[PDB]
Amino acid sequence: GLVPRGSQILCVGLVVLDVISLVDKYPKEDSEIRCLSQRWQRGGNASNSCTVLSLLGAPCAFMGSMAPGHVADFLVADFRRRGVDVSQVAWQSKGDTPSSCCIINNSNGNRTIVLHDTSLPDVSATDFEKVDLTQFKWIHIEGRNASEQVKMLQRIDAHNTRQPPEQKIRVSVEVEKPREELFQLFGYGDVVFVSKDVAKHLGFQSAEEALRGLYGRVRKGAVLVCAWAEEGADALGPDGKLLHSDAFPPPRVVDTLGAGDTFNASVIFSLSQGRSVQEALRFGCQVAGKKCGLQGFDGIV
Amino acid sequence: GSQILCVGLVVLDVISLVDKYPKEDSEIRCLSQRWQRGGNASNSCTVLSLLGAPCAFMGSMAPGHVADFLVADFRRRGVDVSQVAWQSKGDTPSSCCIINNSNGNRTIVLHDTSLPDVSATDFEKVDLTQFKWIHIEGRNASEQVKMLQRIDAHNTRQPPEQKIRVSVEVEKPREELFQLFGYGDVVFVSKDVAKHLGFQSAEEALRGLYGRVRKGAVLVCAWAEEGADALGPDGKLLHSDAFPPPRVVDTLGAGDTFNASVIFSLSQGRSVQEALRFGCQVAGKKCGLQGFDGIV
Ligand SMILES: C[C@H]1[C@H](O)CN1c1nc(N2C[C@@H]3[C@@H](CC(=O)O)[C@@H]3C2)cc(C(F)(F)F)c1C#N
Ligand SMILES: C[C@H]1[C@H](O)CN1c1nc(N2C[C@@H]3[C@@H](CC(=O)O)[C@@H]3C2)cc(C(F)(F)F)c1C#N
C-alpha cells in the first residue's frame, strides 16, 4: 500500500530465526535431552531495531535477504506482528534464511551458539539500486558486505545532492562486528554507531578513547556514537564536544539481548524527531535500560 | 487389512549440520540447516511410505504453523493423517538437532510442549479393520495398555488370517513403560533402555528381558553399529551385523528406520532372520544419507 513520501525509517541488515533452548545441563554429544523452556525469536541487528522503531511509534521498513520457505514465513509473520513494513526484502533463489540455535545452561548461565550458515547472499548494491528512496526520511545500514554497502551509501548521497535540505534522507551506519572490511563505513553517514566490542578490538578501553581515536575516520559533520553497556553512552560531533549519558539500569536485569539495537533505534528515532544529540543519547540509554528489565521488546514504551 | 498404523510422536526437527560438535560456551558457524519432520512413530511412517507400504499416523498435534509444516510433510509422503488427535491446549513439539558431519553423530535438545498425549478414549474411536499392523511407540503406558487390550479384544473375534499384528517400542528408560513388554507380537527394546537395566549387549538384554514378553512374542534389540538381535519362542537367538556406510553423515532416525523396516519385512511374510538383516540394511543405508530420501 501507499507510503507517504519521507515518512519511513529504513533498516538494512540481517534477520535471523533464533531458537533459544534453556537446559538443566549441557548436552553430551549423541544424546537426547529435554529442555526446560524453548523460544523462537526473530533476531538480527537491523531486524531488532525495526521492532523498537515500530513500538516507538515510527513507520519503519526492513531491507534484508530472505529465501522463500517456512523460516521466512515465521520471520515475516513476526515482522508483521511488530508492524514492520517488509515490501523491500531481497528474496533470494539460493541459500537458507538464517537460523541460529542457542543453548543456555541453567546451572551457570553459559551460552553455546550454533550460528546460521553463510549460504544466503547479502543485499547487493544492484538490489538497493532498484529501491525508490522517496518514502524514506532515514536509512540505517548494519555493516555487513561493506564494499556493496559503500555503493548503497554513494547512491543516498547522489539522491540528497538533488534534494532541498528538508527532503534530505538522513543516514546512519553501524560497525558492530570487529571485521576490518567494515572500517571503511566510518567515512559514510550522518550518524555512525561503533560497538564496545569493535572499539575494544581496536585497543580502546572506553567510549571516550574510541570516539577521540576514531573521529578522524568519519565524514565532515558526522556524529560518532559509542554505547559502553552499563557505563552509558557517548557521542561526538563536529563541535569536538564529547557528550555523555549515564545508563538507566533496571531494578533487576531480565533480558539484555537486543539492548544495543534498542539504543541504536532510540537514538535514530529521537534524532529523526528533531531532538539534539544530547537528548538522543539520554533517550537511547533510557529505552535500552527499560528493555534490560523486560523479556523481549514488549513494554519498552 | 491393508495399512500399517504407527501411534506416537511427531516433532519438527530444526537441524544444524556442523564440522565439529560445539564445545560448551562457544560460537560455531554451521555448514547447513534444514527442517525435518521427526518423532519415532512419525519417522517410521516416512520409512514405511518409502518402502511402498500404505501407512497411517496417529499422534497429538495442535493447530498452527508448526502442525501445517508437519501435515504438509506427512501428506507429501502419502502418510494417512486422518487419525491425528488434534489438541486445543498446547503447541506442537520442536527440537534442536545438531548433526556432526565428521561421524554422523546426532544430538537432540527436545521441547515437549506438554501437549496431551493420545488417550485410550481417543484410540477407541478408531476403526481397526483397515489396519493389518499397529505399532505403538511407548509414551503414556497406562493409557497405551488399554489401547493394546482393545486390539487383543478385536483379534479374539477374528480368524487367524484377519488378525492385526502388533508391535511395541520401549525406547525411553522410564519404569512406567516396562509394563508394555507383556503386549504385542514384536517388542523393540532400545540399547539405551537395556544399558539402563544393566545389560552390556543385545544378547544379554534379550535373555534378561524375554520372560517379560507375551507367549509367542519376538523381542528385538538393535545395538547401533554392532547390529541387531531378535529372540522368539524357540529360544534361538538371531543376529544381524550392521550395514554401516563407508562415511556416516546422518544417524538421526536410524533406529526408526530399523523399526519400520523390521515391521515391513515381517508384514511381507519374511522370517525374523530376514527382517533383522533388512532392518540393519535400510538403517545402515540411511546413515550414509541426509534425511530419508534415497534409502530405497
Ligand atoms: C546500549 C547501552 C547504553 O550504553 C546503555 N545501554 C545498556 N546496555 C546494556 N548492555 C548492552 C549489551 C547487551 C547485549 C545486547 O545488546 O544484546 C549487554 C548489556 C546494559 C544496560 C543496563 F543493563 F545497565 F541497563 C544498559 C542500560 N541502560
Ligand atoms: C538400528 C541399528 C541396527 O543395529 C543397525 N543400526 C544402526 N544404528 C546406528 N545408530 C543407531 C543410533 C542412531 C541415532 C538415532 O537412531 O536417531 C545412532 C547410531 C548406526 C548404524 C551405522 F552407522 F553403523 F550404520 C547402524 C547400521 N547399520
Curated annotation (Swiss-Prot), chain B:
It is an enzyme of class 2 (transferase). CDD domains: Ketohexokinase. Requires potassium. Inhibition by ADP. GO terms for cellular component: cytoplasm; cytosol; extracellular exosome. Gene3D superfamilies: 3.40.1190.20. Its EC number is 2.7.1.3. It catalyses: beta-D-fructose + ATP = beta-D-fructose 1-phosphate + ADP + H(+). Changing residue 41 to T: In FRUCT; no effect on ketohexokinase function; decreases enzyme activity but no effect in substrate affinity; decreases thermal stability. InterPro entries: Ketohexokinase-related, KHK, PfkB_dom, Ribokinase-like. One of its GO terms (biological process) is response to glucose. Catalyzes the phosphorylation of the ketose sugar fructose to fructose-1-phosphate. Belongs to the carbohydrate kinase PfkB family. PANTHER family: KETOHEXOKINASE, PHOSPHOTRANSFERASE SYSTEM TRANSPORT PROTEIN. This is Ketohexokinase. It comes from Homo sapiens. The lineage of its organism: Eukaryota, Metazoa, Chordata, Craniata, Vertebrata. The gene is KHK.
